[PDB]
């Protein structure tokens, strides 16, 4: 019963960590909203370059195609 | 909509070429329109098996070769 | 010169496609369908064949003015003096036609317009023995009479693919003048009968088994064909299959954009009637009665069809025929129906086994071929032979066995004594033997040198090893469905 899209709807207004494919970097910020495309938006997103916060990017909008995985 | 005719290759072992020069041996269990191969897992390239029953994604397929005639 | 006639010339009527291409195509199996069209007396099967041929070739000499117009049918596949004067197809005068399917593909077909009259069924039997698919053809009017049923039974017993042609709709629309719902009902009844006879596979317009033809007016279609032509603009790419599936089999459009299976309040008719049959009615009714300008406009608009300024001044039948041709572009839907139907080539094994014996080690490369029947196709002695393995070349020596000596041979096996050359090879094409050097596997060709080596229905072979010979098998004598009991 615990599917991805309903857990993602529960993951709205919650802290999330985004990983990507090529020329890529981990993140850590409070998820704002999502859609069927899985376009993301975070507030206080910290650019964890291989688990090392290079810069506090803050208000950001991540593209869907470059997403690899999303975690706590 | 065009169903890839794998019923010739159903219930036969196949050498699946997949992303990054990786190979998959295994007898075929089923498939879908995206070419996602449902297959009984076998030894992955000396050689070693991961898993019992596997489902390979179509996008990751390079090819699939007839091991059994 | 001669009376009992063919072409006998260098200049055979030129084809739209080129015969070099056709022969190239015929290099490989899985791309040579042997159709052997079949049916009752005056099914229209010969007329259907003629339509196909005409569609294929540019200008034929024999295609006179009147036949072109469509008063007389250009019976192109009754070459015999007799077969003309008598009004019956009598011997196998098939053709090799590089036929385009509805989906873009080019397959050379070996048609065989066999006889329909039930005394000649002997000849027909050969076609069944020859052909891997069979276009059975049926008159709507007479429906499926006993003869058709018998044919069906033979085909199923002879292990051959079946793909039906409900022919001569012109009759029920103009002769019987049936209302469209009535016509639909009739069709259903027919197809019901067919289904009853064919216990195995169930035929229908859906799956492209049935073909709706009128060879006098000169048009065939599968629903798939027609739909493709005239219901691709309107409905989207993916939902077309669904539409096709719907059309036939009691579903009513209901005045609305997604039909119901049961009864509908506003309109009366089914989808098949509303979306095919009714259009045909409109065409016919208008292609006679409608003021020509109006008709031209309608054609321009809905079908996307431009009438020739000559065609405006045609007589009402030939005009109608022309219009029909313009509408249903070719005999392409028919070909699609065939190909789709005979997408099984695992049936080949069943066929061969049925004919000769259940065996194996046949694809070793030893050329062998069922000598079907001696014909007199260009006047001279020819032997119509269907090749299964290998390939035969012109000026090659061959072992031949009359199927009198078949069972005996089989018994003896568990010293290739008879032998003959192959003087020339060619291809039947209605009225001409088109000479070709190659004679590849899975096809039908005509050969000179065989004939005198046997009486009727021989086998041939040419082993490169005694071991290979041991592995061979030999066709049984063709059980010609009718037994000859008229003693003169």
């Amino acid at each position: 019963p615990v599917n991805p899209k309903p857990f993602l709807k529960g993951l709205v207004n919650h802290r999330v960590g985004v990983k990507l494919k090529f020329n890529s970097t981990e993140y850590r910020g409070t998820l704002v909203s999502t859609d069927n495309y899985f376009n993301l938006q975070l507030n206080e997103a910290e650019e964890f370059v291989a688990g090392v916060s290079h810069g506090t990017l803050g208000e950001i909008f991540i593209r869907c195609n470059n997403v690899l995985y999303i975690r706590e | 909509v065009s169903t890839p005719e794998l019923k010739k290759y159903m219930d036969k072992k196949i050498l699946l070429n997949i992303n990054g020069s990786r190979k998959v041996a295994g007898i075929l269990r089923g498939y879908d329109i995206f070419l996602n191969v449902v297959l009984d897992d076998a030894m992955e390239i000396n050689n070693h098996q991961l898993g019992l029953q596997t489902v390979i994604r179509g996008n990751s397929i390079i090819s699939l070769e007839a091991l059994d005639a | 010169e001669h009376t009992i006639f063919t072409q006998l010339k260098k200049n055979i009527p030129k084809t739209r496609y080129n015969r070099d291409y056709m022969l190239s195509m015929a290099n490989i199996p899985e791309r040579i369908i042997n159709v052997g069209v079949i049916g009752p007396l005056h099914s229209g099967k010969t007329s259907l064949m003629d339509l196909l041929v005409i569609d294929s070739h540019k200008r034929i000499p024999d295609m006179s003015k009147n036949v072109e117009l469509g008063w007389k049918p250009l019976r192109y596949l009754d070459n015999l003096k007799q077969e003309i004067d008598r009004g019956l197809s009598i011997k196998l005068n098939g053709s090799t036609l590089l036929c385009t399917d509805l989906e873009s593909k080019s397959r050379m077909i070996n048609f065989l317009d066999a006889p329909g009259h039930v005394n000649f069924m002997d000849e027909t039997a050969v076609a069944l023995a020859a052909s891997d698919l069979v276009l059975i053809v049926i008159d709507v009017v007479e429906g499926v009479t006993f003869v058709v049923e018998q044919l069906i039974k033979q085909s199923i017993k002879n292990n051959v693919a079946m793909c039906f042609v409900i022919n001569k709709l012109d009759r029920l629309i103009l002769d019987l003048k049936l209302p469209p719902m009535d016509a639909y009902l009739k069709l259903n009844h027919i197809i019901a009968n067919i289904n009853s006879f064919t216990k195995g596979n169930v035929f229908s317009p859906i799956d492209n088994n049935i073909i709706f033809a009128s060879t006098k007016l000169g048009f065939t279609f599968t629903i798939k064909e027609f739909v493709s032509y005239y219901y691709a603009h309107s409905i989207p790419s993916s939902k077309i299959d669904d539409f096709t599936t719907r059309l036939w089999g009691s579903v009513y459009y209901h005045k609305g954009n997604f039909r119901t299976k049961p009864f509908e309040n506003v309109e009366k008719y089914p989808t098949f009637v509303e979306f095919i049959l009714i259009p045909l009615y409109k065409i016919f009714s208008y292609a006679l009665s409608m003021e020509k300008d109006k008709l031209k406009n309608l054609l321009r608009s809905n079908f996307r069809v431009n009438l020739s300024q000559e065609a405006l001044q045609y007589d009402p039948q030939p005009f109608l025929k022309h219009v029909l041709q313009l509408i249903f572009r070719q005999q392409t839907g028919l070909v699609d129906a065939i190909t789709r139907c005979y997408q099984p080539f695992e049936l080949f094994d069943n066929k061969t086994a049925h004919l000769s014996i259940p065996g194996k080690s046949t694809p070793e490369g030893t050329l062998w071929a069922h000598v079907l029947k001696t014909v007199d196709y260009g006047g001279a002695e020819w032997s119509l032979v269907r090749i299964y393995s290998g390939l035969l070349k012109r000026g090659d020596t061959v072992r031949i066995l009359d199927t009198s000596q078949s069972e005996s041979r089989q018994k003896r096996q568990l010293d290739e004594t008879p032998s003959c050359e192959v003087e020339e090879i060619g291809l039947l094409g209605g009225r001409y033997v088109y000479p070709v050097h190659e004679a590849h596997k899975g096809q039908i060709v005509l050969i000179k040198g065989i004939s005198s080596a046997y009486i009727k229905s021989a086998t041939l072979y040419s082993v490169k090893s005694k071991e290979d010979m041991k592995q061979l098998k030999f066709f049984k004598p063709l059980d010609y469905i009718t037994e000859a009991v008229f003693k003169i």
């Binding site: 899209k5 999303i70 | 898993g51 489902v55 390979i56 | -």
Partner: protein
């Protein structure tokens, strides 16, 4: 015959030891158990673990991984 949708419905109800390989990626694998399923190949995985390849058990938890970059599954 078993389409991928039906085999993943077995992986959904079972929740048996899954091992995931990743798209455009040889350096890392995953090891967990299937918990979710989308109409796309998106699947959420609880008890997932990041497992670098045999050329160790590195830390990872429950993850909604975007399923368009999947390679292997085996429960």
């Amino acid at each position: 015959m078993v389409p991928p949708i039906n085999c993943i419905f077995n992986f959904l109800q079972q929740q048996t030891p899954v091992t995931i390989w990743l798209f455009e990626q040889i350096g890392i694998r995953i090891k967990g158990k299937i918990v979710g399923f989308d109409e796309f190949m998106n699947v959420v995985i609880d008890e997932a673990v990041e497992i670098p390849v045999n050329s160790k058990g590195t830390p990872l938890g429950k993850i909604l991984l975007k399923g368009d970059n999947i390679t292997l599954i085996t429960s």
